[PDB]
Design a protein around this ligand. Sequence first.
Ligand code: NA
Ligand code: NA
Ligand code: NA
Ligand code: NA
Ligand code: NA
Ligand code: NA
Ligand code: NA
Ligand code: NA
Ligand code: NA
Ligand code: NA
Ligand code: NA
Ligand code: NA
Lengths: 28, 30, 30, 30
Amino acid sequence: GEIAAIKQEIAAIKKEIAAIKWEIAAIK
Amino acid sequence: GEIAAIKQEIAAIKKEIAAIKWEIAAIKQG
Amino acid sequence: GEIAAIKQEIAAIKKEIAAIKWEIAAIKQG
Amino acid sequence: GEIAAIKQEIAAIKKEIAAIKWEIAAIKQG
Ligand code: NA
Ligand code: NA
Ligand code: NA
Ligand code: NA
Ligand code: NA
Ligand code: NA
Ligand code: NA
Ligand code: NA
Ligand code: NA
Ligand code: NA
Ligand code: NA
Ligand code: NA
């Protein structure tokens, strides 16, 4: 359960990073 | 613990992401 | 100005959450 | 196994985050 939780939290971060890259593209 | 260490590393990363999103918001307002 | 404001509100909130997660992680090492 | 994989996934993320700060720096001078 502890590892499962961590892998889901890491997965979430990748989506936040992806979004930021698109938002920078918009604003460059 | 290896797990304790990891939770602190995740926390740190989220702080760095938060900071970037502030900088972007600021830039968009001009 | 509208989305600009709301994106700043969101950014501020994520900074607060990051800070809290760090303190929870640390509290566990205590 | 599990931990090795997580630590490498975390390391990778910090690399992507670092790269983004290089772009922000550029934009805040432009
Ligand atoms: Na966990
Ligand atoms: Na967890
Ligand atoms: Na994001
Ligand atoms: Na630019
Ligand atoms: Na986050
Ligand atoms: Na940062
Ligand atoms: Na933002
Ligand atoms: Na969010
Ligand atoms: Na806080
Ligand atoms: Na804190
Ligand atoms: Na990764
Ligand atoms: Na990147």
